[PDB]
Amino acid sequence: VGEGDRVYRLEVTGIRSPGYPSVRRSSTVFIVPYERLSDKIQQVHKQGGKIVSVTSA
Amino acid sequence: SIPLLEYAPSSQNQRADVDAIIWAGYRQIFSEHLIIKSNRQSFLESQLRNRAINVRDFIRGLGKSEVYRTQVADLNSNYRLVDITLKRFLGRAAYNQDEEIAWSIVIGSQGLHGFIDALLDSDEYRENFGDDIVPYQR
Amino acid sequence: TLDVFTKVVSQADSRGEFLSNEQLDALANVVKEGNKRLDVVNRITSNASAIVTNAARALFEEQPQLIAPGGNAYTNRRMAACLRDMEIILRYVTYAILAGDASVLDDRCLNGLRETYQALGTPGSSVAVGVQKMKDAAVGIANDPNGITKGDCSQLISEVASYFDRAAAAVG
Amino acid sequence: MTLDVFTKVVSQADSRGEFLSNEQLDALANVVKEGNKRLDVVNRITSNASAIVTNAARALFEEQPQLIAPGGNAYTNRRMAACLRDMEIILRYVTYAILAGDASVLDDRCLNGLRETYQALGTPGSSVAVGVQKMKDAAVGIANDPNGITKGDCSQLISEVASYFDRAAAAVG
Amino acid sequence: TLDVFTKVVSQADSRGEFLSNEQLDALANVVKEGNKRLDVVNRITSNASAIVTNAARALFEEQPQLIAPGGNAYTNRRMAACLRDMEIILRYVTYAILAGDASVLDDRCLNGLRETYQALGTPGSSVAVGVQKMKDAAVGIANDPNGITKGDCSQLISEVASYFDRAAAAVG
Amino acid sequence: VKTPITEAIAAADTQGRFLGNTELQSARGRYERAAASLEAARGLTSNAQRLIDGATQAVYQKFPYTTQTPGPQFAADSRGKSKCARDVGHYLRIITYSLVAGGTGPLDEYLIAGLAEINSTFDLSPSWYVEALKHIKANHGLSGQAANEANTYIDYAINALS
Amino acid sequence: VKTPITEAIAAADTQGRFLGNTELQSARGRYERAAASLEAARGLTSNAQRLIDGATQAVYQKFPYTTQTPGPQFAADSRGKSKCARDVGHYLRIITYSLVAGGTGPLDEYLIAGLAEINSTFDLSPSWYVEALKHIKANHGLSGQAANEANTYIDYAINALS
Amino acid sequence: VKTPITEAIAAADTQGRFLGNTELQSARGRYERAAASLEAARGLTSNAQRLIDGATQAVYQKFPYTTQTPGPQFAADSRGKSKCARDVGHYLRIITYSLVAGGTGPLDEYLIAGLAEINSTFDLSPSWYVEALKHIKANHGLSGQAANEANTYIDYAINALS
Amino acid sequence: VKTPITEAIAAADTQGRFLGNTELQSARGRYERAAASLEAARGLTSNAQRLIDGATQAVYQKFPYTTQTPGPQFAADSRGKSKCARDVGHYLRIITYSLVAGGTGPLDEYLIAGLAEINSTFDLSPSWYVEALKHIKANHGLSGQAANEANTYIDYAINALS
Ligand SMILES: CCC1=C(C)/C(=C/C2=NC(=C\c3[nH]c(/C=C4\NC(=O)[C@H](C)[C@H]4CC)c(C)c3CCC(=O)O)/C(CCC(=O)O)=C2C)NC1=O
Ligand SMILES: CCC1=C(C)/C(=C/C2=NC(=C\c3[nH]c(/C=C4\NC(=O)[C@H](C)[C@H]4CC)c(C)c3CCC(=O)O)/C(CCC(=O)O)=C2C)NC1=O
Ligand SMILES: CCC1=C(C)/C(=C/C2=NC(=C\c3[nH]c(/C=C4\NC(=O)[C@H](C)[C@H]4CC)c(C)c3CCC(=O)O)/C(CCC(=O)O)=C2C)NC1=O
Ligand SMILES: CCC1=C(C)/C(=C/C2=NC(=C\c3[nH]c(/C=C4\NC(=O)[C@H](C)[C@H]4CC)c(C)c3CCC(=O)O)/C(CCC(=O)O)=C2C)NC1=O
Ligand SMILES: CCC1=C(C)/C(=C/C2=NC(=C\c3[nH]c(/C=C4\NC(=O)[C@H](C)[C@H]4CC)c(C)c3CCC(=O)O)/C(CCC(=O)O)=C2C)NC1=O
Numbered sequence A: 001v002g003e004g005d006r007v008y009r010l011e012v013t014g015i016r017s018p019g020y021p022s023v024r025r026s027s028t029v030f031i032v033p034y035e036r037l038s039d040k041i042q043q044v045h046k047q048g049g050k051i052v053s054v055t056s057a
Numbered sequence B: 001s002i003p004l005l006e007y008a009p010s011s012q013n014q015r016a017d018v019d020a021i022i023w024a025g026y027r028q029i030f031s032e033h034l035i036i037k038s039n040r041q042s043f044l045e046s047q048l049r050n051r052a053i054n055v056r057d058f059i060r061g062l063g064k065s066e067v068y069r070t071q072v073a074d075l076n077s078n079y080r081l082v083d084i085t086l087k088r089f090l091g092r093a094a095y096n097q098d099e100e101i102a103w104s105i106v107i108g109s110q111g112l113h114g115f116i117d118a119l120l121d122s123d124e125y126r127e128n129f130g131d132d133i134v135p136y137q138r
Numbered sequence C, E: 001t002l003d004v005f006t007k008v009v010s011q012a013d014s015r016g017e018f019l020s021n022e023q024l025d026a027l028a029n030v031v032k033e034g035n036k037r038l039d040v041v042n043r044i045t046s047n048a049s050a051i052v053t054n055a056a057r058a059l060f061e062e063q064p065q066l067i068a069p070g071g072n073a074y075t076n077r078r079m080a081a082c083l084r085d086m087e088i089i090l091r092y093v094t095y096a097i098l099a100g101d102a103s104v105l106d107d108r109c110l111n112g113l114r115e116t117y118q119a120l121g122t123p124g125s126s127v128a129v130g131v132q133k134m135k136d137a138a139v140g141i142a143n144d145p146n147g148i149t150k151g152d153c154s155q156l157i158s159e160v161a162s163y164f165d166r167a168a169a170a171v172g
Numbered sequence D: 001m002t003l004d005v006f007t008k009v010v011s012q013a014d015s016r017g018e019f020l021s022n023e024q025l026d027a028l029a030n031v032v033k034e035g036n037k038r039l040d041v042v043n044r045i046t047s048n049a050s051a052i053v054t055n056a057a058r059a060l061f062e063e064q065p066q067l068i069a070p071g072g073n074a075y076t077n078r079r080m081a082a083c084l085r086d087m088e089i090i091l092r093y094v095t096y097a098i099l100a101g102d103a104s105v106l107d108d109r110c111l112n113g114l115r116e117t118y119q120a121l122g123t124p125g126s127s128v129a130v131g132v133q134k135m136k137d138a139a140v141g142i143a144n145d146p147n148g149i150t151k152g153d154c155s156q157l158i159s160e161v162a163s164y165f166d167r168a169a170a171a172v173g
Numbered sequence F, G, H, I: 001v002k003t004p005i006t007e008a009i010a011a012a013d014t015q016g017r018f019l020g021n022t023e024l025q026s027a028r029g030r031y032e033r034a035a036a037s038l039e040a041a042r043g044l045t046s047n048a049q050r051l052i053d054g055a056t057q058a059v060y061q062k063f064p065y066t067t068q069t070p071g072p073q074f075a076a077d078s079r080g081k082s083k084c085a086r087d088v089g090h091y092l093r094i095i096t097y098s099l100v101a102g103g104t105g106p107l108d109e110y111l112i113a114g115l116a117e118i119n120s121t122f123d124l125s126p127s128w129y130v131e132a133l134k135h136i137k138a139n140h141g142l143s144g145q146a147a148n149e150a151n152t153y154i155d156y157a158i159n160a161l162s
């Protein structure tokens, strides 16, 4: 869902939130393209998880 | 670009498994009849099974899908569409009439595609449903 | 979203007959005049930003309380609000001349316009004094011949100005 | 996460589970006493916030001039506005660190995953920390200058204002 | 998404020079050879559904355990799964011939396809036996000397078949 | 609904920008082909009554059981043959509609939208209608580039059938 | 990036369908204007060095204070005039790039994306660059329909400036 | 709109909880600061007419071409100079508004919201207004901590200009 | 021929003296005038086929009898209209000649010497070419700079006709 193919893989370590209903599984990848990557890193840091790796695709 | 005008919020009362999830996403947005045969997209179905594309990402495609635009965006007025858009993803009818009107001017400038992206971006929407959960009535 | 090509289909579907030969001779003139239509459209969009402020040199100079303290075009966001959608009139009028039928314009641009303009508190009649000032500048650019082969696009000029008059009628 | 000087001396004191000692309260009493200086000083950074970034961009690009020349990653115009979009975000979070008084709010935003994107995108990571040092040379020059302000020693704040820039340059380079 | 027109821009931007005259004489042949691309493209998409089942029978008749009980094309949604994306090869190969460069092909059919085909357990090499059977039927339709006018489509036919060979290399 | 003039609009509207030369360029292309597309509309409208009864008796040839088996779906009864020329006569309308529109829009919105839902319920096999359309594309008598023009949209209805 | 061949793809890709005749109509249309667009590229490439120094000394005429006021931003000394012919010479590159692409894409992605952010920070008034581009569109010496072709993209950069 | 009393409310409202002692502290801070902020409001209101004509003739000094070049945008004739004292006189209003509010809210909502949109269209260079505000912050004659108080909001309008 | 370079030369020749600073300053007045003029000639050479088509049709609509009256002098036959585009096609050369030369030399030597001498004999009314040039004066499309210099030569030819 990105106008162009510019997708970077993201790996978060440990996501703290309401842990049963809101984040059922931490340490999972989120596949966000180039346009919202500015927005996505601010979304992850609001929960408090830290990024491991960011791999393009 | 410019910050949204402040609108008053009216008080509100509200304030096999894999296959089913796909249907649920389709059902809220298309109200059953619309999916038909033609509206369904092979790529979206594959991504979910594949899991390359997230559900939050999945819905955006449906919202921005060409079939959806002809059925709702073209026929309905911009103001009606904003109200119409709210029921399927947010699951709640807008509390304030003025607020709905404010959303409509923004929709016109960025187009149908632009408005849908904005809803996902808003903090209230993501928090209420979550990426994993399909949109539901509130 | 309808067209000249698609609207003569849509009523022809409602009566359920094949398209007649004089409707195809009508559409053959639409194709024939298509090149002229394209030229007019490109001149409006290339002078699109120059029209809006030159309309805003008169939309506010003629009714000068609007930007004076108290008027609804007073503060700076409010001023940028009637340039953010003075151009949306031009954004959809140019869509109407491209499609050749005002059905695209009616659905989004003017369907709910007269309702918000009493909900917000803005003067609705003070829009259509300046959309007429856009039409006075739009048909002045579209008719003038600069570096262009001589041709007669008079029919377009009158029904280009009909789209502005529809754009002023549903706001006032 | 967001910690402070006041809250971090709580958080380790919770982990040991004892009451706060009197010499920790005498430590925090100096923080309240030295607290006023930080606000006045930090107001000077934010008032000259936009003036710092371009004056750092008169040297970040003049020293490594291929970056804006055709081929470099600061070449085209949205690429150029991209390294002014987030040159200031360094200043947006360094000023949050001096306000909080502890770099624990700095390391979640500029230091956490920044070194990962900067090899995913293709931007030179080391060419950032040549100019964040040029921000620090201009930031402590403004924060120290005494203009129309009563004079008191501001040395403790300045040394560890520059420590936040050095942490901001270490996790990018 | 790149093109023939846009890729000769993109390397020309990386060297930062104006476009040379022999690059414009190259692109002038692309415009001149442009009409042929459309003719080839429309014949593939009009026989798009006829290729897949004809390609498909060979795909299952040659390796007959695949639909026999045990194979990964056995049950009915599994069978409809290798017709739901046998055509996606044709959906993006026709995008590649339209664009004229395989840079839109390698993001969708060639990027992560060899990764899913291992985890999934579906044979990967049993795809590229039948994508070759598509190419044997695609260039037979595109090069048929029927209708239109006689012309040289040999250059297009060989690099139409190069897109299928790239489509078979990254799966096998 | 889908039209090259419409597709220029809906692309430029969702971006919120004006009509660039890339949307405008697309419109220019349509005119060259719309001159040859209206040639194909008169070729099918004038030969309309020959083509319908040419088609609905060609499908009876390849499927002789359709006039013999007693069923509501079957056309063996006169009432079926009355609904035969209605249905096949509906196809040449929408094919001529999508000719003058230049796009597949009227074909996409009137004919093939939800066609898999209706043919499963009424048990109308889609192999019947594809046999009539192969008779139309070979017997319209059209020539030149206009013969290519009707041949795309007929074949586009064929692929949506199967 | 925005191109009439690309715009046919991204429209048909988001719909998950094949290339219809409505996406395929544009390609045929595009070649006819692309034949006259490449005429406009050679007209600007051959007259490139006359047009740059024709422009950067025309902006000094209407704005004589730009060579007099001592500022990093202004073109007072030779370093500004060295960055003068760089910046105006960057414009004729991207205008010639968007000519052969047929769309506004390279103009949209290289030049005008984020131009309001950069001109506010470095205090470069956009009234300077629009004065150079009016000199280019009147002094390129191009004629015929190709003279229309460069005149759209120059004027498209003008509207994005203001 | 942005105010330290408002910022305590909108923080505690989005959590759905009451006013804690933390929300209260922000309000508490305003009273001590607000005692010295209202000192800065009377210093600018009493010297208002000296400061406006002190500013609009200081910008004519550094930019002498603005009174000479004939254009609607420039202040060549008396109509521009009439709109000169209107615009610069609008700035001292909003600066005095954001003084007594304690926050940047009235400055954020009346003045700088959408300022990049308006200065691009009317070609008003933002280097003009920043030259007037540097004259105001040096010639208001304010002293003490109140001299710091007006100096933030003037400099906050400077950074939003560039 | 007359050129303000050679005007400085032939004046210094009759006095029999060297090129002092009196004749030298006449040279750079010609030199920096060419920048405006050269562009001003490029606006006419690019629009060559437009103006001779425009001025010829403007003559017929102004004087409707010149297409109907039988005579060699008039444009009733085809060879009259063939000689029509030759004549105004000959005017636009000398205007581009006298713009490039920078003086009224080629207008003197090639057009207006004996121009009132021939028109008495062939009964060609000079008011025909007055309205022909006045169409070029309004429709050449050049505004400012070189065009003002360019226009004078149109008005210098009109006063020579009358
Ligand atoms: C049904 C599958 C499933 C499980 C099991 C599940 C568990 C689960 N336990 C969590 C946290 C947690 N789970 C524990 C559990 C324990 N800590 C101890 O010391 C004890 C020995 C132990 C309980 C006996 C704790 C302490 C946390 C909070 C961790 C933190 O806040 O950092 C979280 C995330 C944090 C949260 O939202 O609370 C998850 C997802 N989520 C699921 O979807
Ligand atoms: C922030 C403004 C705001 C308000 C006030 C609000 C009210 C609200 N009250 C509700 C129900 C209710 N409210 C009451 C209230 C009362 N019963 C009594 O006897 C008393 C007289 C009275 C309270 C003093 C009851 C009994 C229900 C449940 C009714 C039912 O489920 O049938 C509901 C539906 C269920 C829910 O709580 O989600 C809403 C949304 N929503 C808002 O957004
Ligand atoms: C696509 C067709 C379309 C149009 C044209 C449209 C207009 C429109 N203009 C609005 C407000 C506005 N409209 C204006 C415009 C004006 N007020 C003035 O003072 C001037 C006289 C006049 C301009 C000449 C202003 C300043 C606002 C903001 C008013 C407010 O926020 O209360 C609003 C309500 C709030 C909004 O979303 O921004 C709508 C819906 N909406 C549409 O969907
Ligand atoms: C989408 C990109 C595009 C454009 C812009 C375009 C315009 C365009 N306008 C044309 C003609 C023309 N255009 C005009 C237009 C006018 N003359 C007047 O005096 C009127 C004031 C005005 C109409 C209001 C005329 C009169 C002609 C004469 C030739 C014809 O009939 O097409 C032609 C004919 C072919 C050519 O000029 O080479 C082109 C190309 N073609 C394209 O492919
Ligand atoms: C709040 C913490 C945070 C940061 C810092 C951040 C940075 C960030 N920088 C980006 C791009 C970028 N950043 C730069 C930066 C630079 N180029 C240079 O040569 C200089 C050394 C430097 C400027 C000083 C450039 C050029 C790009 C775009 C590169 C490209 O797209 O090709 C992107 C890509 C997409 C987007 O911006 O929306 C992100 C997400 N994101 C975050 O969440």
Ligand SMILES: CCC1=C(C)/C(=C/C2=NC(=C\c3[nH]c(/C=C4\NC(=O)[C@H](C)[C@H]4CC)c(C)c3CCC(=O)O)/C(CCC(=O)O)=C2C)NC1=O
Binding pocket: D036, D037, D039, D040, D041, D043, D143, D144, D145, D146, D147, D149, D150, D151, D152, D153, D154, H033, H145, H148, H152
């Ligand atoms: C150049 C190095 C240097 C610095 C940085 C400096 C700052 C400084 N700020 C001071 C006071 C102060 N500074 C502030 C500033 C503020 N309070 C607020 O609540 C506002 C938000 C903010 C202004 C925006 C205040 C309120 C005081 C009180 C004492 C005074 O009036 O000076 C004092 C008084 C003496 C002291 O604190 O020991 C010092 C030293 N002095 C120096 O020699």
Ligand SMILES: CCC1=C(C)/C(=C/C2=NC(=C\c3[nH]c(/C=C4\NC(=O)[C@H](C)[C@H]4CC)c(C)c3CCC(=O)O)/C(CCC(=O)O)=C2C)NC1=O
Binding pocket: B042, B043, B044, B046, B047, B049, B050, E059, E066, E072, E073, E077, E078, E079, E081, E082, E083, E085, E086, E088, E108, E109, E110, E113, E116, E117, E120, E122, E123, E126, E127, E130
């Ligand atoms: C040789 C005969 C044969 C075929 C044809 C075949 C295809 C095939 N493709 C599959 C999956 C898939 N195929 C695709 C392909 C794509 N999805 C997209 O959105 C992309 C555009 C596109 C690639 C370019 C995807 C995404 C899956 C998901 C499941 C997986 O990873 O295998 C699977 C998994 C099992 C099943 O579907 O029942 C089958 C059977 N298997 C066979 O035995």
Ligand SMILES: CCC1=C(C)/C(=C/C2=NC(=C\c3[nH]c(/C=C4\NC(=O)[C@H](C)[C@H]4CC)c(C)c3CCC(=O)O)/C(CCC(=O)O)=C2C)NC1=O
Binding pocket: E035, E036, E038, E039, E040, E042, E142, E143, E144, E145, E146, E148, E149, E150, E151, E152, E153, F033, F145, F148, F152, G021, G024, G025, G027, G028, G029
């Ligand atoms: C068997 C090998 C072979 C091929 C492939 C072939 C194709 C072919 N297509 C042609 C024309 C053409 N082909 C098309 C096709 C289309 N234009 C569109 O915009 C539509 C989307 C599309 C149809 C769906 C058109 C419009 C022409 C114009 C010339 C003509 O009418 O033939 C011509 C005319 C002569 C030439 O181009 O040199 C050739 C050669 N000729 C051959 O000998």
Ligand SMILES: CCC1=C(C)/C(=C/C2=NC(=C\c3[nH]c(/C=C4\NC(=O)[C@H](C)[C@H]4CC)c(C)c3CCC(=O)O)/C(CCC(=O)O)=C2C)NC1=O
Binding pocket: F056, F059, F066, F072, F073, F074, F075, F076, F079, F080, F081, F083, F084, F085, F086, F087, F088, F090, F091, F110, F111, F118, F122, F124, F128
């Ligand atoms: C406007 C485009 C359009 C078409 C073409 C169309 C066809 C269509 N034909 C139908 C039935 C039918 N279609 C046929 C036609 C045939 N069966 C035969 O035996 C012959 C082989 C063949 C004709 C050559 C018959 C006989 C029925 C009635 C079957 C039944 O009632 O079960 C039905 C379901 C019931 C109905 O409303 O009558 C539809 C929807 N609908 C549309 O909206």
Ligand SMILES: CCC1=C(C)/C(=C/C2=NC(=C\c3[nH]c(/C=C4\NC(=O)[C@H](C)[C@H]4CC)c(C)c3CCC(=O)O)/C(CCC(=O)O)=C2C)NC1=O
Binding pocket: D058, D061, D068, D075, D076, D077, D080, G056, G059, G066, G072, G073, G074, G075, G076, G079, G080, G081, G083, G084, G085, G086, G087, G088, G090, G091, G110, G111, G118, G122, G124, G128
């Ligand atoms: C590839 C397309 C492209 C262009 C055109 C471009 C221009 C551009 N010119 C700039 C500065 C500049 N631009 C100019 C140019 C001028 N100033 C004047 O005084 C003259 C009036 C005028 C030239 C005629 C000067 C002198 C600077 C340096 C100003 C400064 O450093 O503050 C800057 C900011 C700093 C920089 O990296 O050098 C950009 C981004 N960037 C791009 O990516």
Ligand SMILES: CCC1=C(C)/C(=C/C2=NC(=C\c3[nH]c(/C=C4\NC(=O)[C@H](C)[C@H]4CC)c(C)c3CCC(=O)O)/C(CCC(=O)O)=C2C)NC1=O
Binding pocket: C057, C060, C067, C073, C074, C075, C076, C079, H056, H059, H066, H071, H072, H073, H074, H075, H076, H079, H080, H081, H083, H084, H085, H086, H087, H088, H090, H091, H110, H111, H118, H122, H124, H128
């Ligand atoms: C309430 C806050 C507020 C301010 C401050 C404001 C300013 C403002 N000044 C404007 C024009 C103007 N602004 C000026 C002012 C100046 N130009 C010069 O030459 C001098 C350097 C400078 C004054 C020192 C002039 C002369 C005009 C008219 C320009 C024109 O008509 O093109 C315009 C556009 C046209 C208008 O309505 O009059 C706005 C919106 N608008 C607002 O809503």
